[PDB]
Write an enzyme that holds these catalytic residues in place. Sequence first.
Site, PDB file in Angstrom:
ATOM      1  CB  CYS A  63      -0.918   0.011   1.215  1.00 59.86           C
ATOM      2  SG  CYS A  63      -1.864   1.500   1.370  1.00 59.86           S
ATOM      3  CG  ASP A  92      -1.775   4.425   3.609  1.00 60.97           C
ATOM      4  OD1 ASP A  92      -2.918   4.742   3.225  1.00 60.97           O
ATOM      5  OD2 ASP A  92      -1.513   3.346   4.177  1.00 60.97           O
ATOM      6  NE  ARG A 112       3.376   5.756   9.954  1.00 65.40           N
ATOM      7  CZ  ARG A 112       2.348   6.372   9.370  1.00 65.40           C
ATOM      8  NH1 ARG A 112       2.364   6.634   8.067  1.00 65.40           N
ATOM      9  NH2 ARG A 112       1.283   6.723  10.100  1.00 65.40           N
ATOM     10  CG  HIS A 164      -0.283  -1.008   6.146  1.00 70.05           C
ATOM     11  ND1 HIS A 164      -0.416   0.174   6.840  1.00 70.05           N
ATOM     12  CD2 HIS A 164      -0.591  -0.720   4.856  1.00 70.05           C
ATOM     13  CE1 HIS A 164      -0.772   1.136   6.004  1.00 70.05           C
ATOM     14  NE2 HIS A 164      -0.947   0.615   4.805  1.00 70.05           N
ATOM     15  CB  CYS A 193      -4.659   0.622   5.905  1.00 68.65           C
ATOM     16  SG  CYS A 193      -4.524   0.987   4.128  1.00 68.65           S
TER      17      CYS A 193
HETATM   18 ZN   LIG Z   1      -2.361   1.643   3.672  1.00 70.68          ZN
END
Ligand SMILES: [Zn+2]
Lengths: 207, 207, 207, 207
Positions: free
Chosen positions: B28, B30, B32, B84, B87
């Site tokens: 994804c 976003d 980290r 994750h 999210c």
């Molecule tokens: Zn995400």
Amino acid sequence: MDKIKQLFANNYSWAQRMQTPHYLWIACSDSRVPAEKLTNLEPGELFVHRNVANQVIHTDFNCLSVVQYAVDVLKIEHIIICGHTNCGGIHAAMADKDLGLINNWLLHIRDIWFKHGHLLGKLSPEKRADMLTKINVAEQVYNLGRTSIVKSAWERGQKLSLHGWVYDVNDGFLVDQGVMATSRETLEISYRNAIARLSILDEENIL
Amino acid sequence: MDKIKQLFANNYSWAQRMQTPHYLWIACSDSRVPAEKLTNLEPGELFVHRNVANQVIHTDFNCLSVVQYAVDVLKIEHIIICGHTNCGGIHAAMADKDLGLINNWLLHIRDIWFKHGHLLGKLSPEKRADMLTKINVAEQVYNLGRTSIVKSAWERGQKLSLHGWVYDVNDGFLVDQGVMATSRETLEISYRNAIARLSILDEENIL
Amino acid sequence: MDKIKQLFANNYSWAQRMQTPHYLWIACSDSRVPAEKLTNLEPGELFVHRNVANQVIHTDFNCLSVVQYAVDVLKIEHIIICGHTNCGGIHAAMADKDLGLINNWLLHIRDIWFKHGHLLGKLSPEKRADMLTKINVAEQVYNLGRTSIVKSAWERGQKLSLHGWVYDVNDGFLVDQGVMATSRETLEISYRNAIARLSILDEENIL
Amino acid sequence: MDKIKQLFANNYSWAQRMQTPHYLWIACSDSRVPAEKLTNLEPGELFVHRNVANQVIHTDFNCLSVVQYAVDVLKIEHIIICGHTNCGGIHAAMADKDLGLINNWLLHIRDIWFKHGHLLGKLSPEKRADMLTKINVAEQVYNLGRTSIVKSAWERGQKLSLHGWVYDVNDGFLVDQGVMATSRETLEISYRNAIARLSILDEENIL
Ligand SMILES: [Zn+2]
Ligand SMILES: [Zn+2]
Ligand SMILES: [Zn+2]
Ligand SMILES: [Zn+2]
């Protein structure tokens, strides 16, 4: 696999031994070094899209969605397109093979090759892939700046700067390719400037 | 910016102070932690696609291209979808806001929400986003396994295994969500199994 | 409203009063005159895709799907791209209005306009739209012919021929634009000639 | 070949012998009967999109572009999705043949089939395709109505109405499927009712 088992072992060992995003990072799927490692940025700083040959295709719903979300919703003020040397996607684009569905994605790169076909045709064959990689980054920034999403942001006075870099695997340095836009006018000028600077060939590589 | 200058400083300092891909990693935008940091993998091992909420959308030319290239050309034998916790894409999907073009991308997540609406409706509101994240991963693996690209690979006897994991930001561990496919039959069984296991709610979270 | 009631009345009245397709017809969503009327072909002969300004965009799943289905499954041996004068899509693409999402779709047309900018610039302003409409058709045949689907259909010996025509709304006469491919070599040659021919201007079209 | 010569002869002969659009018509590429013939509307009244099995896929740039252009720029107040019986696209989606790329396009239809599997399973096998054709139309109106484009058109007070019809090839009578929205609330209600109605089976359709 034993490869999947090893991965779970590495993950466990790693994890045991061990905020607002400010950048949208558009990178390539075959680049080895993460944006985070390259930039040494704090986790959460980076919002990252990776596709083959780091493209902004006019009508790619995936990438455009990411861009609209970053700009309109997350209020990110810096979008960076990062290319890289030894790019397998670029080499895949330049090869004369039927690779299947991926070739359709890579036809945009070949359109860029033909657009700069005079430049790339004045250059020794073995140097073209690196030139194309660099020109690609310039063109993708240009594409990004021409999206409805980015035009509209600029027009309503939102702060938004586009950047186009390449990193060399040989030294790890991020090299700015010259296209840096904060407006449509700065986009046109810096784009033209960057292509003009790129089109100055080394005398020893000229055919 | 001073943010862009700082980034060039960090890059220089980092770089100064300092092969075949075997996995396609779909993550994804976003999240980290890089795939490389999570897996502690050797650079070049990972071929990585990142989109919002780590989706395999039936008709996404971007993601499908990456998949066809990984499987048909690179001969990668493991595709991993990694979700994750926390999210932002999933939270964006669940919110009732007009976010613009991105909402269209996220309607696929909302279709998944409604598909499992009985499960998610038996669950306390504040726990749903984590459940949806997990179910999302299962559904995307299912989508991946139903692509023409993956069906065809299996049918011609190519070795290909699909995996669906989630990592928690709280501990860094990769948690397997149960859908693991090496064939269409193993895809159907493990998918059903995984949804059934996911649908067993903790008694303290049941409405 | 009454508009729709009228629609159903028209239809009820129309209905009361009263198969292998062999062609794929790609045409514009604006287009007034249906394909059947243009060709006097029998029902079922035509498999039809309509989009804004009759594009075959390299990475458009919708159109490529149509093409792959037509070629690989229906075994259609003729694909026709048909433009038309007074094309609203072409006019939209040439205007510098922000129209929103559709501008991203029409950027492919503007790329084509820029590609042929020298030619188009030496035309009379009131003839340029129609010139671009014709160039567009030639470029879309070119695009169609460079798809993995068409290329590999040709490579495996499947009989398949690509066509690009334009009709003037004033008189309804189909005019062939000159790009006609039965293979990748004949695509190259006839595309090169088609553009070359369009570049020989008739004085009355000259600025 | 002679096929194409004949085409031009037909046209030349046809041509010799011889405006604000108000509707967006989304129909199937298979469809035999043109929109104008179905509706007896005047030329220029119809803006038409045709794709395989008349889909509004959430993330299809092609169709969404058409819709956004129609709504925001042409100011069209009526959007009609029109399915038809004996739909080759629907039949393709229900078969378990590997047809290649198009299967990925048709997976959205299979998702819909699964979604309504209990209903569809209690039908006679030779009636299921036509039942799915009707359910498809209802689902695509639903999809259209959940687009950011339509939703925000409604939110800002733009007059816009969505329709979903089906015609039987045997008799040509347009039949309304019951999903008709002038707003998001009327979309919900009439979609819920439309499916509920389709779920009341007439005994002669029962297995
Ligand atoms: Zn995400
Ligand atoms: Zn690369
Ligand atoms: Zn048109
Ligand atoms: Zn049909």
